[PDB]
């Protein structure tokens with residue numbers, strides 16, 4: 895239980911974060927030119943939320959894997975000085991920050 899409760903806390907704080915807007919819903923490939931070709935395994939906060947409520951997380955490790963997948967995708971597709979890039983850096987630093995002050 896207590897392993898996924900802090901996953902609920904982390905995901906809640908990330909969902910309500912100021913810099914969270916580029917990762918709340920899945921990237922719409924019809925809108926983002928080149929995203930389908932470059933990102934082979936897309937991930938966002940809503941998909942992690944769905945899988946968390948539906949229970950499909952065996953441990954905190956798969957959850958953390960999905961978050962790091964969000965930010966790996968962000969850094970793969972967007973420049974570090976793009977708006978999505980800067981947001982993604984703030985969100986990644988926030989996630990590792992809060993994740994480390996539990997484990």
Ligand SMILES: Cn1cc(C(=O)NCCCNC(=O)c2ccc(F)cc2)ccc1=O
Pocket residue numbers: 915916917921925926967968971972978
């Ligand atoms: C995680 N992540 C998020 C985004 C992102 O959120 N991008 C803005 C949202 C798209 N929404 C639009 O409305 C739109 C799209 C294209 C256009 F030409 C005009 C408007 C992009 C790359 C990425 O890796």
